[PDB]
Amino acid sequence: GKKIDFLLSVVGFAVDLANVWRFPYLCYKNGGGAFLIPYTLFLIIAGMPLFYMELALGQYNREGAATVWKICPFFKGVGYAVILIALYVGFYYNVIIAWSLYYLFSSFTLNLPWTDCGHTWNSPNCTDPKLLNKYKFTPAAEFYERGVLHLHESSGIHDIGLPQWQLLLCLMVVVIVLYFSLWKGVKTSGKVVWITATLPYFVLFVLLVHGVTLPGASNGINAYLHIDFYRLKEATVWIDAATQIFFSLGAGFGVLIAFASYNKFDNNCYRDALLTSSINCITSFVSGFAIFSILGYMAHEHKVNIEDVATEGAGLVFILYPEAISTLSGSTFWAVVFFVMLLALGLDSSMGGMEAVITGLADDFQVLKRHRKLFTFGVTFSTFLLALFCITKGGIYVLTLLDTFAAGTSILFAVLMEAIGVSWFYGVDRFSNDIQQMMGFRPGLYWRLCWKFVSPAFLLFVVVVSIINFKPLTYDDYIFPPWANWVGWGIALSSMVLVPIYVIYKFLSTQGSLWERLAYGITPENEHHLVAQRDIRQFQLQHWLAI
Numbered sequence: 001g002k003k004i005d006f007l008l009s010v011v012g013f014a015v016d017l018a019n020v021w022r023f024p025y026l027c028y029k030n031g032g033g034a035f036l037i038p039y040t041l042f043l044i045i046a047g048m049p050l051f052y053m054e055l056a057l058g059q060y061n062r063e064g065a066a067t068v069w070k071i072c073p074f075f076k077g078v079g080y081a082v083i084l085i086a087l088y089v090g091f092y093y094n095v096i097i098a099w100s101l102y103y104l105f106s107s108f109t110l111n112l113p114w115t116d117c118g119h120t121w122n123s124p125n126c127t128d129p130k131l132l133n134k135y136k137f138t139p140a141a142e143f144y145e146r147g148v149l150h151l152h153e154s155s156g157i158h159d160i161g162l163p164q165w166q167l168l169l170c171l172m173v174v175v176i177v178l179y180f181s182l183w184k185g186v187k188t189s190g191k192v193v194w195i196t197a198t199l200p201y202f203v204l205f206v207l208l209v210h211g212v213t214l215p216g217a218s219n220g221i222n223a224y225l226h227i228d229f230y231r232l233k234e235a236t237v238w239i240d241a242a243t244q245i246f247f248s249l250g251a252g253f254g255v256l257i258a259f260a261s262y263n264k265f266d267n268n269c270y271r272d273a274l275l276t277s278s279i280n281c282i283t284s285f286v287s288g289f290a291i292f293s294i295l296g297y298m299a300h301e302h303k304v305n306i307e308d309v310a311t312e313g314a315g316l317v318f319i320l321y322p323e324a325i326s327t328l329s330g331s332t333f334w335a336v337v338f339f340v341m342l343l344a345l346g347l348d349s350s351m352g353g354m355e356a357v358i359t360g361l362a363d364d365f366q367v368l369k370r371h372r373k374l375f376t377f378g379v380t381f382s383t384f385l386l387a388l389f390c391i392t393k394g395g396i397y398v399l400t401l402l403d404t405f406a407a408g409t410s411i412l413f414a415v416l417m418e419a420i421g422v423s424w425f426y427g428v429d430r431f432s433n434d435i436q437q438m439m440g441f442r443p444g445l446y447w448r449l450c451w452k453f454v455s456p457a458f459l460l461f462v463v464v465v466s467i468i469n470f471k472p473l474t475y476d477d478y479i480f481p482p483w484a485n486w487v488g489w490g491i492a493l494s495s496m497v498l499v500p501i502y503v504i505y506k507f508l509s510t511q512g513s514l515w516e517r518l519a520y521g522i523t524p525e526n527e528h529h530l531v532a533q534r535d536i537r538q539f540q541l542q543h544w545l546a547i
């Protein structure tokens, strides 16, 4: 029983809504394997050391995202930045979960709505492969676009319109469930592992086994296994891979630190990082394989090329997985099972993010930690309103803008600042000593080098490239107006600029000389007495030249 519980905990921690929903369309947009090569490279190099470092920080300091920076006061801005990023991602994650709940509700029938045209939401251009000899006019795409989003009533992000009442009700139910699953404490989140630790793997295995034996899966798999290096020479794939890695692993959102703050003081963070990274890699590879099998089948069915079967934006899963399910026997049961799995995964991810935000903002303010119910209600209500903002007719455009800009460059910068702060200022040797005291063994030279030099270097490279090489935002065949890009960059800067603001605020809040102010702002808060003794390690070349 204990072994099963441990295994289930590990797998549930490893899987996420990101791996199931976001990775499909990012891999499809970026070719196939051409995305897996850089994805795996970044996974190892940045994700594994950063995941390990975040878990270790949370476990050792016993604090959330914001308050953990008592070791280096100047990076409370980084903490607040990750909290804001988590808030935005929570908005649009809750919107996605509302989509999933609507699909589950509509799946409770014998004639699935995404099988043929002829409904009230079907345009006259709907084409049915079975009722007759582009991608927008397929029955599943038609359903997703019209009978769920009702996107056919908005001309763009400038005419989003009014919230859809069906999606409004689904979002209300999702938010009520989240609030009642978050209002008591962390303990309630530890008993939901069983549903999310088995269903995703069972569904993925069934989908893989079925898709392999499909008329058009061969060419889809061939395209998946074909690598285009001219795509590897564009840096869009690299930016997407880095962002998706930091999404799937959960690093950079404050979730890992907050969750680890509640761990035992002797837990093995190294093994946790290893297992989570390995399972993430394998799950991502399998998800890509199944996704490309399904869309190769679709390319063979709709008689179109593999590059134009499905939309490259969000909703690829909601257009694809129903299509695969429609070909199974007793498709109603499989649809119910798959959408229940999606609901469970989304609820778990949203609970994790909301817990991150709540713990981070509650450890900083004691009055907020003393009223967990009211604080949870306030955060949940704000998230509900800002997600309602994305339920309008043109809600997919706002969702795309948020998904592109809230995270991405902002999360890369936040993680880069976390790594630079911790390693360079707090001492990689000091961090390794803390690890040794906590778990019992010093990390190997590879971990220290990755924390200090390799990971910050690649993170800086990607952060710069994502800024110089930035393409205007678009959704399929819709080109966003320039002010949309300006608003997106403002959203990213809203969390990127919290670091210098807090740095200058702390500098002008402390009293003393410039050198004294810097020493106070660099020293851990529990060693401030050493400042008066003129004993600062950061003022010696030995500390900076330490591997």
Ligand SMILES: NC[C@H](O)c1ccc(O)c(O)c1
Binding pocket: 028, 029, 030, 031, 032, 223, 224, 306, 307, 312
């Ligand atoms: N944007 C890339 C496009 O979706 C695509 C998918 C599969 C491919 O084999 C390909 O060459 C391009």
Ligand SMILES: NC[C@H](O)c1ccc(O)c(O)c1
Binding pocket: 016, 018, 085, 086, 087, 088, 089, 090, 091, 093, 094, 247, 248, 250, 253, 255, 349, 350, 351, 352, 353, 354
């Ligand atoms: N990968 C998703 C990530 O764990 C996350 C961060 C913040 C959130 O509000 C959320 O729902 C999920």
